[PDB]
Design a protein around this nucleic acid. Structure first.
Ligand SMILES: [Zn+2]
Ligand SMILES: [Zn+2]
Ligand SMILES: [Zn+2]
Ligand SMILES: [Zn+2]
Ligand SMILES: [Zn+2]
Ligand SMILES: [Zn+2]
Lengths: 187, 585, 296, 186
RNA sequence: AGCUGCUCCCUAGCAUGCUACUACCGC
RNA sequence: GCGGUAGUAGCAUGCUAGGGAGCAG
């Protein structure tokens, strides 16, 4: 606050005050240059203090709208990401078997817990111990959900490949034993 | 959180705009910020204006407001100048002593390492300051080498040559083995593993490390590692003990190290001794005789390059028990007869890039001249040993300085070991030049070596010097003289026995064309150490600071034992060298 | 949020009353608003008197009051002029350099594209101002093309001729293939799919893209797409390389492109070259010979 | 805070008023020094207020950043401090069953499995030298973890079973010494 | 990597309020 | 001599906002 119409006027008033104080002519001169510093002070009261508040207001508004601009950019980014995820995951599901299972519904609305049952192209078994392994996935082929599956890529908790000959009865205590058998849909 | 560079006072401030981001104390950091253009400081938090969307990076414009650092117009009414009292706000405020002379470290921080005076500063400033000079020097030029184009192969003409395109915008690096490239195989996923090759012009002749077949579109880059600040200074202070402490002398000695034994008498009594290592006097003989004098000790055979430690490995095959030897290179083809990666053994043969953190008895560091302050300090960072042994000699060869353009760096200031080697003199040397005849050894004694090298056998009368003028043609990064290839044109005629005098050359491409005309083998003057031939021919071809350099060419002269050819086109060495001279055909 | 038109300074202000709503910097936007009739500006929020039931749209009449922009009589006692210092209030205040010559951009912004001098302006102004010239050109005529009547069919005469009525109020586009119509089948729900036709007078001959039979009451419109802004300039800067970089020459050539080879000799050497194409000299021949010279 | 410039002016005004009240001369001449002294504590407690809060501002910010530095330096050394603390507690623990195996591992007897605790179940203890054999295994009994095990399957490092009576000092430099001496608990 | 509820500590802001000092104005 | 207003500083209360941590289901 130095380049306002009031700095000049206050400077002139104080210049007259100091000039006539060095002159020091009359008591009325002191009264006039005191009643001049006591009015030109109002000039530096409002000309340099209310405008000192407008700067605070303007800065507040500017930062607020900066924040809102960032808010409205993040929306575009999340929208793009979500739509891309939708359009890339859709690409895996539309087999012809989905069409065959939906076209035969009386209405077109099929339950959700039967879509993977009769359309999935890969099964994942998790077996806790060899006893359950023998009654579920014994041999290279097994049948679940009234289909025929063939086994490949058996793995364990540490996710290391385990061949089918290793899982005997006596070798069982030497395996990480949430074994995860994955199988393909034979035809 | 640590100590600053000049003052070593405990501090927490790191100059953001600086090359390697070192620690600086409050007053010390302020002295840097006003005495440089480095206007960024980075403490445990960043000193920037944290109000949204500001760009001010200088510290003076910043003021503290609340729990942050604010600019001019973003501050609250309550503020405080970060830059006050000539010391910028920072942790460890009172415990700062400041540095009286800071302009040295300002110059290093603003240095571009372009002229020789930059290196003079790099070696004249104080201990950790000159280590930082080495740090900044290296850091700069690895930031440089990848700023060149990428060598993308276009066509496969035949074996040993290819076609090379380079990316638009950035230039082509020199055509030598100085800039070692490295390749990866571009695939549908990423780039993986070709290996280190160096390219020259055919057509682009490629010198590959291993056998390999390339296709179209594969490109190589000049890779850099992650350069991490050293700990120890260049070398430990000198201390002369009363006696050989910690070591047990031998019982009897063989003759071939007698002149060496009366030498190891003194390197064993103090910790270090720079060795005036004149080329080919039994230098690795000197190294192995240390173990012959002290068998039970651990002797650390290292060098700046693997091809130099291979020289000490050669004489380990014949004189050293291999039961107690070790060859250390990480996962390049080298001498790999010893057991690989055996840390706690007596003889460890390795290169500074791979010496593991260990403790050993005595070290032998081959070629102290090819190395800078950096590796010569990281060796101390590797070993705090009982005795240090400095093989190499500044009058042999320095590392090739890429950024050194104006002025040459004198024998004095290659590295710290080069300091006391000619101010207080070398502690040590061997005078029996097992290689050179009297024609060369007396010439090189009166060259720089303090009139030192005594004759070995005889004046062979087989070394030739002849004066010429020559006209010079240079295109990209080379220099070819047709007429000086036209004087070897006719001298190899009357001799049916100088067919086997290998062609040495300052620039490899000139002799690469000569070998298309003649067919003699090649040789690089910059890395000529390690192999010596009885008969070699050579042309300086240039009067500037490449071949007429006294020590850069002393190596080319000194590797012949009976005969050598030196076609001199200069006045600098004609009146200075003396061989037998012939007329001009 | 981006760079303004003339200055390319980072900005957040967009002229509402302008044709294509481009970015403008504070001083740059103020220069636009005084040197045009474009008296609307639209930052991350709209600059309109937000007090209930106000009409004012010009920025100068607006003043900031509290958390909004206010008109003359709607303001609170504490206010501030949005239009001050010759730069309008907006984001990225200090990072504005302004443009010395803005009247070209004001001309393109006030242009109706009607005489030849407008097109001279379209190709005289600088790079992205002239990209904007093309943008605004195509924008004005695509807004124009729908402002004609709409070709509703009344009766079916026979094959290839029909009878067309047009709505009252707006005129008839010309009788050529210049304005390609497009129709959809009016149904009980909506209009779906006829195709692109062009009509001339018989009776009204209709030239349809495909074979189709029409009935009474179906109508055709001159559709426009959604014209988005461009990124790249009209063409890249010219650069002449030393040699044919990144291409492998051929081994042997056939005769019918020999006079063509000596031309691809140079185009392979640098980026781009304008091809003086007098009609029917072997032009698509000239293009296939590029592949004959460089097959891969 | 007394080293500020305004304090000098305040002191001069206070001395003037002290002289005035000690003389008690006028009514308005001293009133001048209520228009010139009551002001003297207006540019004094305005300048000596903000600096005093600035002091505590700097102190609080310094403490915050010191704590942040300590927090960054602590969570970057956990995998040395954990081991130091563990071994200090272990040597404070003072249990022979622990000290036995700790010393044995300090010279080489590292087990190759979890030490079983049942009266049955198998153990395998690497033994790299002979002096180590002297203390631990005597005849048929294996002393380890302050327990009594039974020696059964001594074997060399090239996977060849080596008999028990063979183990002696003179013939010791005849075997692949990293023995794996399987045993069972008492 | 959940939903609440209570409590402590630090800072910022606005408003309110209180008190003190200075200036202007008539009475 | 009073009042009022404009200022400045100090203080208190409370409300909001932001950050840290703890307890209970
Ligand atoms: Zn710096
Ligand atoms: Zn310092
Ligand atoms: Zn700022
Ligand atoms: Zn506009
Ligand atoms: Zn602009
Ligand atoms: Zn209004």
């Amino acid at each position: 606050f130095s380049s306002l119409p009031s700095y000049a006027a206050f400077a002139t008033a104080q210049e007259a005050y100091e000039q006539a104080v060095a002159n020091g002519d009359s008591e009325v001169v002191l009264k006039k240059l005191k009643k001049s510093l006591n009015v030109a002070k109002s000039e530096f009261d409002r000309d340099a203090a209310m405008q000192r508040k407008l700067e605070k207001m303007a800065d507040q508004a500017m930062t607020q709208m900066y924040k809102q601009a960032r808010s409205e950019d993040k929306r575009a980014k999340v929208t793009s990401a979500m739509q891309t995820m939708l359009f890339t995951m859709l690409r895996k599901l539309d087999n012809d078997a989905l069409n065959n299972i939906i076209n035969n519904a009386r209405d077109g609305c099929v339950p959700l817990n039967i879509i993977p049952l009769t359309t999935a192209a890969k099964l994942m078994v998790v077996i806790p111990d060899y006893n359950t392994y023998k009654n579920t996935c014994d041999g290279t082929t097994f049948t679940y959900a009234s289909a025929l599956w063939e086994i490949q890529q058996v793995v364990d908790a540490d996710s290391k490949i385990v061949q089918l000959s290793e899982i005997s009865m006596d070798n069982s205590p030497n395996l990480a034993w949430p074994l995860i058998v994955t199988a393909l849909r034979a035809n | 959180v640590g100590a600053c560079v000049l003052c070593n006072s405990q501090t927490s401030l790191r100059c953001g705009a600086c090359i390697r981001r070192p620690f600086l104390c409050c007053k010390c950091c302020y002295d840097h910020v006003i005495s440089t253009s480095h206007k960024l400081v980075l403490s445990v938090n960043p000193y920037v204006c944290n109000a949204p969307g500001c760009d001010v990076t200088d510290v003076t414009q910043l003021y503290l407001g609340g729990m942050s650092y604010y600019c001019k117009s973003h501050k609250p009414p309550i503020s405080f100048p970060l830059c006050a009292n000539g010391q910028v706000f920072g942790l460890y405020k009172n415990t700062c002593v400041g540095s009286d002379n800071v302009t040295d470290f300002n110059a290093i921080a603003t240095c571009d390492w372009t002229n020789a005076g930059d290196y003079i500063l790099a070696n004249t400033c104080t201990e950790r300051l000159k280590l930082f000079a080495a740090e900044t020097l290296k850091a700069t030029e690895e930031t440089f080498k990848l700023s060149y184009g990428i060598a993308t192969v276009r066509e496969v003409l035949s074996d040993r040559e290819l076609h090379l395109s380079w990316e638009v915008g950035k230039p082509r690096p020199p055509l030598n083995r100085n800039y070692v490239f490295t390749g990866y195989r571009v695939t549908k996923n990423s780039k993986v593993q070709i290996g280190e090759y160096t390219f020259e012009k055919g057509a682009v002749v490629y010198r590959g490390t291993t056998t390999y077949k390339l296709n179209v579109g594969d490109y190589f880059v000049l890779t850099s590692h992650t350069v991490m600040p050293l700990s120890a200074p260049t070398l430990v202070p000198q201390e002369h003990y009363v006696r050989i402490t910690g070591l047990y002398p031998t019982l009897n000695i063989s003759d071939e190290f007698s002149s060496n034994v009366a030498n190891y008498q003194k390197v064993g009594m103090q910790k270090y001794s720079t060795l005036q290592g004149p080329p080919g006097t039994g230098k690795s003989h000197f190294a192995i005789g240390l173990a012959l004098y002290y068998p039970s000790a651990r002797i650390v055979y290292t060098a700046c390059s693997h091809a130099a430690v291979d020289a000490l490995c050669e004489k380990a095959l014949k004189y050293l028990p291999i039961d107690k030897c070790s060859r250390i290179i990480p996962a390049v083809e080298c001498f790999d007869k010893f057991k690989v990666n055996s840390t706690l053994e007596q003889y460890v043969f390795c290169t500074v890039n791979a010496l593991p953190e260990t403790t050993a008895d005595i070290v032998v560091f081959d070629e102290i001249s090819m190395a800078t302050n950096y590796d010569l300090s990281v060796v101390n960072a590797r070993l705090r040993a009982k005795h240090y042994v400095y093989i190499g000699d500044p009058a042999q060869l320095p590392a090739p300085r890429t950024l050194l353009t104006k002025g040459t760096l004198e024998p004095e200031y290659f590295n710290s070991v080069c300091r006391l080697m000619k101010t207080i003199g070398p502690d040590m040397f061997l005078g029996t030049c097992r290689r050179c005849p009297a024609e060369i050894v007396d010439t090189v004694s009166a060259l720089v070596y303090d009139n030192k090298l005594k004759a070995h056998k005889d004046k062979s009368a087989q070394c030739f010097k002849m004066f010429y003028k020559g006209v010079i043609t240079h295109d990209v990064s080379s220099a070819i003289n047709r007429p000086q290839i036209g004087v070897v044109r006719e001298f190899l005629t009357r001799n049916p026995a100088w067919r086997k005098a290998v062609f040495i050359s300052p620039y490899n491409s000139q002799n690469a064309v000569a070998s298309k005309i003649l067919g003699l083998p090649t040789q690089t003057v910059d890395s000529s150490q390690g192999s010596e031939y009885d008969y070699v021919i050579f042309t300086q071809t240039t009067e500037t600071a490449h071949s007429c350099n006294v020590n850069r060419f002393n190596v080319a002269i000194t590797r012949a034992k009976v005969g050598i050819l030196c076609i001199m086109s200069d006045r600098d060495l004609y009146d200075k060298l003396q061989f037998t001279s012939l007329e001009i055909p």
